[PDB]
């Protein structure tokens, strides 16, 4: 009956679900387990570049906390 349309809709749902899950896991993997730093405004970019300079490894996401100061 009506539930015969549901395998096609399920395959279409998986083929819409691959991009979102894919880009979320790619952003979380390529930034050390965290979301990609959203830098829309230049203050956020200044802080991002400051992180990239203070990390020592030329990666903005490698955070340095209180262990890096004395």
């Amino acid at each position: 009956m009506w539930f015969e349309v549901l395998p096609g809709i399920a395959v279409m749902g998986v083929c819409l679900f691959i991009p979102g899950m894919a880009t979320a896991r790619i952003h979380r993997f390529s930034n050390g387990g965290r979301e990609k730093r959203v830098a829309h405004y230049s203050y956020q970019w200044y802080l991002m570049e400051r992180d990239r300079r203070v990390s020592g490894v030329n990666r903005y996401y490698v955070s340095k906390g209180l262990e890096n100061i004395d």
Binding site: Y41, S42, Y43, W45, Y46
Partner: protein, 167 residues
């Protein structure tokens, strides 16, 4: 190369203008002007003017060149084209090789030969685009500007309804 990306898009912009300015037809003229509007929008986008580049795409190529192609496609249906094309391209590439070898050129004013990244600022603007605030100041400051522009558009509607009436 990549430091010269605004320069590369500017060269492609001039090549597009020599491409349609030799005028094969209004159809291919519109085609070349569309490609030139896209690459000039890219020139705008590489300085941080994202809203003005999207005004190019949304208004220029979105409304006006669509209406140009719309009128061209229903109201129309060489040697000199190719010759003027290669003439303008030889002028442009002579200028390109001059500024490649000399790092300085004077056509009318004097011009630099460096990459055009050298004309920027090194600071940050906080929590706003500067150009976004400047266009947001159209309503809070530009009272006279909005009045004369809106009145010109209202008279534009009136004028087009007068002269396309035929009677």
């Amino acid at each position: 190369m990549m430091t010269y990306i605004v320069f590369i898009l500017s060269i492609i912009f001039v090549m597009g203008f020599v491409g349609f300015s030799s005028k094969p037809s209004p159809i291919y003229g519109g085609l070349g002007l569309i490609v030139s509007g896209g690459v000039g929008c890219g020139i705008v986008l590489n300085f941080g003017g994202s809203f003005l580049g999207l005004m190019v795409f949304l208004i220029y190529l979105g409304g006006m060149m669509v209406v140009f192609g719309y009128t061209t496609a229903m109201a129309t249906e060489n040697k000199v084209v190719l010759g003027t094309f290669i003439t303008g391209l030889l002028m442009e590439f002579l200028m390109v090789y001059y500024v490649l070898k000399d790092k300085e050129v004077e056509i009318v004013f004097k011009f630099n030969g460096m990459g055009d990244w050298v004309i920027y600022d090194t600071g940050d603007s906080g929590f706003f685009s500067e150009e976004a605030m400047g266009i947001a100041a159209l309503y809070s400051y530009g009272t006279w500007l909005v009045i004369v522009t809106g009145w010109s558009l209202l008279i534009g509607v009136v004028v087009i309804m007068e002269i396309t009436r035929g009677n």
